[PDB]
Design a protein around this ligand. Structure first.
Ligand SMILES: Cc1ncc(C[n+]2csc(CCOP(=O)(O)OP(=O)(O)O)c2C)c(N)n1
Ligand SMILES: Cc1ncc(C[n+]2csc(CCOP(=O)(O)OP(=O)(O)O)c2C)c(N)n1
Ligand SMILES: [Mg+2]
Ligand SMILES: [Mg+2]
Lengths: 801, 801
């Protein structure tokens, strides 16, 4: 930790290149319109919300960036990637409005978006696909997402895919937000990777929402201490220009001492007092410091400002950041929260108009008018000139990539469609499918395989020899090895999955990890990825409750699909078979990166269990994509049922079908369900359409088109709700679902499948139970099956075990 | 960063208090039994799994701790709280066996739990309630959990609730695991809170699973740099005692330079070679370093070891940490991964028996026999003597607390059971309920209100004046204000929620935060809390997709209940009314902290929307607890439907009920569903039991004892699955569910409820639709209703919007 003063002394401060007074006129209009936007929303009394205090404290920081640093998307690269702090969005809207990119009508619909001509509260690409780029409102996610975006830009350069050298990634953070573990938890990575294209800009107004970040301490010193410790270049923007004469005049060093010893809480109290209270409780702490302002009027003292409000000090910091190589830079900008808002942070509005010399007359003020700069005006000319020199306007977003990729055909995955000689797993199928893609000339170098330390567990090690590990194992390595860091891997996957938009360079990430540590562990990033329109694959390896058998409670995933079905634009599959994996991956590839350019990402759970992989039935492709297809029909004269299974448990349903027929003369239709979720969604879509078109012929869910009315039983390696979600659409009156509800534990697969009551013996007993409720067989036969299979009818419910 | 040598020079090292030769014998027997345990499991060929290399690298560190530092649970306090590294559990089991706490049959059932008297793969209290305490295998979670556990212990002391001053929290971490953002993301908190009762022990073997943490860097220096910068006391245990002579006679300072400049990758290469290789490639880098070992044999050079394997260096580090105050200490223990296994770091294990001089012939070795120390042997006596001096054995766990609390009765919440005077929200109801608890002499000081920065948003500010904010706003403050850090807040909640077991001191936490940032953001910790048998309350505030209307996409929660239903021992509720909040909170209190001592925690979503709160219907209490009860029946002669709602949408369902009756002559039963999830679980339980007992009187799902067979419609502020989950158990053939599937966006509550198709209008159309399909009313009536209500039947499905 250094003294509590600017890192860049005035003697090393470059001349400011802009027109300060003109820039302030423009900035005042931006401040005014931002406030107007929020107040007009408030007018409506619809509890719309919206903030003002934060943008007021960071406005000047952003203003210097828009006038002298931020590069917009251009023909060479995507421009600077700015992770705008979420709640200062009203300031971004105000500026875009002044630049003529948004209309008054849109500002007037700030926070009312359902009817189409509105503005989102925060940066949501999914809601404003041509405007926002990075969802930052969910705090903590901005900072780590930025780190990995910066890393991904270096990767694209190193791999010879795109020259991103002129791009800077800016993460605009709040100081309270730095308490999120995700905010500082990955900062050493920027040093390991020498991310000199990354700048963290922390607005140190010393406050969170409901109080100071650390009133009894010095949050700026805390941040400096740990970032410096992590190898970052730290630039503190502490004081404005008026302090420069005062500091060089302090030959005693007591002013510095005074500044260093004062704590956050006290600096914040001074901010509320007055110029007299200041010379008294601050400058008046020591005679030498009190003597420095002895010849100062109380008004001249109150004029002393924080560095984050002085364009000259701000500019020096971003310039130094821009010049720095070898490591990332973090700028700690000292500001006043609710700057110039006196009242809280009609008289209040008048105070603001006056404080910032806003060009709004007394006759118009009550109309809360927006201010505009006419073409020909000095303000209009300068606003646009500065931006034209930096390549246009931002933020802006391109929702589709321009190039046409020549994707592999399903035929290209032919070997995976045939019966397998060796027993393999769906994870081995996934790796083989990836190898098929790495043979495609068009996309082979666009693929981005990602792992979180573990590769061998997923049989990814063979790929290493072929494409190597990215390690600026060299700078040309293709695989991203992110270590024991699922959030980080997820952020790399997200940067890759959105490169198609950000850099007009489609990249296709496959991130494979232990499924339990996916949505459960990085779920907020997964939701953010949907907002960001990510197009990529999440492969949840070692999936299924009973299948990663020895690992136990915190590893056995019988519910990731329940978490994944909550994401609207995540498409989820739980395939059993080698060929389904191939069809599913080919289709996802086509949908996301073919002409359709569908904005969805995929989640495929894969397995670590080897078994016989049969050939794909002729014509089953569409059913596989839609979610279900009839695999086999077994003959039986005594009764008929339908049996459904997915992932590793389909095996055992299929065994149950043999037993039902051989031992009980009960025929069955047997379905592989590659996606209960896609089927449930299709069902809801049909039910919804039907309800809204009462005069039309009811539409039929795909699952109801595949199935008949015979009593049905489903079993999967996931909790019962996974299969129960399609109940409403299943055309049979009786539908019984078995599942792995309950905490996992270590044992053999056989023991866990019996414990969770999903194995063949339970499927059989479940099927006979339905046939008994129909009278087709005597209840006694079900009782006898239970004893026959050594099923303990009285063991505790697995959910409670 | 300091030089790459021990922090503690030999000169300041205390004399080792133990019997080194006897300790080594005992330690070798533990290493052996640990290996035997895993190899026997392997032989079964059931893919059980299990690690050996990591415990070998950390065995000596744990050994010094077990013999000289770890305090077991005792009469005065819970002893030291040791977060053992997940996957060195075989070593803990081996020591426990040697201590006579586990039988051979248990070791022989390592990773086969299902039949009882087995052992979990990792620390899972839910599975071994009297043994393990803290679930750590989900790497990342142990370090942050440990930080907040240490802070919680300080809180307990500061609040005068329990003298925890003699307890130390030890977090045993891997160096690769430190990459998880959660591992270092909160390390600054330990400094803010002066956690001198916290010791992080990082096993620096330089390796994660598939390779080095940073082969081209120095992971120990990275860790030292950031922890030092975060204000921690860092103690490096780099080199064993054989190096002391070398460092002492090297007046050139070259050995140190050489140690400093060598990177992790090269150090790992040395360990894979031999003495000659080290002499040439390490010491041979400089004439002076070559000179230091010129008269050493290659064997003597090869004997040089890493500090983490020398009991004397280990002891000095732990003793120093024990005397360090004002901040937490992190010990960076340098070790060799695959220690003593060398060749592969039945007989290929005789290398291990010879390496550690294990008393087993080259003929019994194939039988993988366990070593024990008979009562009376020098080893047995010493093993137990050292532990007795430390109060017994650990880990161990007490499942229930001993004291009896005198809990508030439901009548104590009587004011909340009456009609409220003004329109309030369920969040206001929650705060009023907490206030009733704060008046109970028995539990008032055991309550732990927890917030993540925002308090005003949840109306928690009034409490600040009453019970204060914990700030060691002073150290007697009761509310934990964790800032913008949901994971940290969750970790404080977890420490509080398990204090009943850990410290035999029941504390009752209530963590309120924005519901979107609950399971979605800290879901892996919520799963771990379940494993840890947490008993507390998670209050998801500002919940419901349409209800936190202006906030938009990353805030509007219409799915946390889908995430929460995945945790077996989380009981979830979405009440509509203040009296339901009261009944649920009272019941939860009695279940978890009353004589039942049920191992479940609660999740209650609450709202930020005010509306009329009617009085509780007489006798509705149990129905509120169970999940559903009938509110009223409205007459109508043209048809009959059932209408269900929960949370903020119930009042709109009631509006629909009035519209149906008054405009269409359609009567209704109206139900408030307080918990769709508990009803679904009850139904699954009933059906499971019935089908396993085909001849017995079947169990009737609770929901089926409340609802009848008239067509039903449900609507809630959550995606359709939340209400669909009970379909199988609803006793009506038509059950239509409305929900908030799709990404949220900013608008008025009215606009969002119409966009998400969940408002009164849609419920009416849904109900009329069912009647028309029964030919009870003309299909035209539905079409006209759609028109009358300005419903756009062709707008896109909200799930895709
Ligand atoms: C994960 C998450 N938790 C909580 C919030 C709610 N929130 C909105 S503004 C705010 C305070 C932000 O303080 P700080 O980061 O210091 O920024 P400032 O407004 O001072 O610039 C919080 C906690 C959020 N957006 N995301
Ligand atoms: C969140 C999470 N991700 C992945 C794993 C899988 N895993 C088991 S051991 C291991 C490597 C651990 O390396 P390190 O932390 O360095 O410990 P060591 O065994 O070297 O002492 C990993 C990643 C896990 N347990 N938890
Ligand atoms: Mg702040
Ligand atoms: Mg390691």
């Amino acid at each position: 930790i250094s003294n509590y003063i600017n890192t860049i002394p005035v003697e090393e401060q470059p001349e400011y290149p802009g027109n300060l007074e003109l820039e302030r006129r423009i900035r005042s209009a931006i401040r005014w319109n931002a406030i107007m936007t929020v107040l007009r929303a408030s007018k409506k009394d619809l509890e719309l919300g919206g903030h003002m205090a934060s943008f007021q404290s960071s406005a000047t920081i952003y203003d210097v960036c828009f006038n002298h640093f931020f590069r917009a998307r251009n023909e060479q690269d995507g421009g600077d990637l700015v992770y705008f702090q979420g709640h200062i969005s009203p300031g971004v809207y105000a500026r875009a409005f002044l630049e003529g990119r948004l209309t008054q009508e849109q500002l007037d619909n700030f926070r009312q978006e359902v009817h189409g001509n509105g503005l989102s509260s925060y940066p949501h690409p999914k809601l404003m696909p041509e405007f926002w780029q990075f969802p930052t409102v969910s705090m903590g996610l901005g900072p780590i997402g930025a780190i990995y975006q910066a890393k991904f830009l270096k990767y694209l350069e190193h791999r010879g895919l795109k020259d991103t050298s002129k791009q800077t990634v800016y993460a605009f953070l709040g100081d309270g937000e730095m308490d999120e573990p995700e905010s500082k938890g990955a900062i050493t990575i920027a040093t390991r990777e020498k991310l000199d294209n990354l700048v963290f800009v922390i607005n140190c107004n010393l406050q969170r929402l409901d109080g100071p970040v650390t009133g009894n301490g010095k949050i700026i010193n805390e941040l400096e201490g740990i970032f410096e410790g992590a190898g970052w270049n730290v630039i503190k923007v502490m004081w404005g220009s008026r302090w420069d004469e005062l500091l060089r005049k302090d030959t005693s060093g007591k002013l510095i001492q005074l500044m260093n010893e004062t704590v956050d809480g006290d600096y914040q109290t001074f901010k509320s007092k007055d110029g007299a209270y200041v010379r008294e409780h601050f400058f008046g702490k020591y005679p030498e410091t009190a003597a420095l302002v002895a010849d100062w009027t109380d008004e001249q003292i109150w004029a002393l400002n924080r560095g984050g409000h002085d364009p000259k000090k701000i500019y020096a910091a971003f310039k130094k950041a821009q010049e720095t190589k070898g490591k990332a830079t973090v700028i700690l900008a000292h500001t006043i929260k609710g700057y110039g808002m006196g009242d809280a942070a009609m008289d209040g509005v008048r105070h603001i108009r006056d404080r910032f010399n806003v060009p709004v007359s007394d006759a118009d003020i009550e109309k809360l008018p927006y201010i505009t700069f006419p073409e020909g005006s000095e303000e209009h000319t300068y606003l646009h000139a500065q931006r034209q020199k930096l390549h246009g306007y931002l933020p802006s977003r391109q929702p589709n990539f321009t190039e046409k990729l020549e994707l592999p055909s399903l035929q290209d995955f032919g070997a995976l469609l045939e019966e397998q000689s060796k027993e393999i797993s769906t994870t081995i199928a996934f790796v083989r499918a990836l190898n098929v893609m790495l043979k495609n000339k068009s996309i082979k170098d666009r693929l981005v395989p990602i792992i979180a330390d573990e590769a061998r567990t997923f049989g990814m090690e063979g790929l290493f020899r072929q494409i190597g590990i990215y390690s600026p194992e060299d700078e040309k390595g293709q695989i991203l090895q992110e270590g024991i860091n699922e959030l980080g891997a997820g952020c790399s996957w997200l940067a890759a999955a959105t490169s198609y938009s950000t850099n007009n360079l489609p990249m296709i990430p496959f991130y494979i990890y232990y499924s339990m540590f996916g949505f459960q562990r990085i779920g907020d990033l997964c939701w953010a990825a949907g907002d960001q329109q990510a197009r990529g694959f999440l492969i949840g390896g070692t999936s299924g409750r009973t299948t990663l058998n020895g690992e136990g409670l915190q590893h056995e995933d019988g519910h990731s699909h329940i978490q994944s079905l909550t994401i609207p634009n995540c498409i989820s599959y739980d395939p059993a078979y080698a060929y389904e994996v191939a069809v599913i991956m080919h289709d996802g590839l086509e949908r996301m990166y073919g002409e359709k350019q569908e904005n969805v990402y995929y989640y495929i759970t894969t397995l670590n269990e080897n078994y016989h992989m049969p050939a794909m039935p002729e014509g089953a492709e569409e059913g596989i994509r839609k979610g279900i297809y009839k695999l086999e029909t077994i003959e039986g004269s005594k009764g008929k049922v339908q049996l459904l299974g997915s992932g590793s448990i389909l095996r055992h349903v299929r065994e149950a079908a043999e037993i039902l027929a051989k031992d009980y003369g009960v025929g069955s239709d047997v379905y592989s369900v590659t996606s209960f979720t896609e089927l449930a969604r299709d069902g809801q879509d049909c039910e919804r359409w039907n309800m809204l078109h009462p005069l039309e012929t009811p539409r039929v869910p795909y699952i109801a088109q595949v199935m008949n009315d015979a009593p049905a039983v489903a079993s999967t390696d996931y909790m019962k709700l996974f299969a129960e979600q399609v109940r409403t659409y299943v055309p049979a009156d009786d539908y019984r679902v078995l599942g792995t509800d309950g905490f996992g534990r270590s044992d053999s697969r056989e023991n866990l499948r019996h414990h969770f009551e999903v194995d063949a013996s339970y499927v059989v007993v479940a099927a006979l139970g339905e046939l008994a409720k129909r009278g087709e067989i005597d209840k006694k036969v079900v009782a006898d099956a239970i004893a026959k299979f050594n099923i303990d009818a009285d063991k505790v419910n697995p959910r409670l075990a």
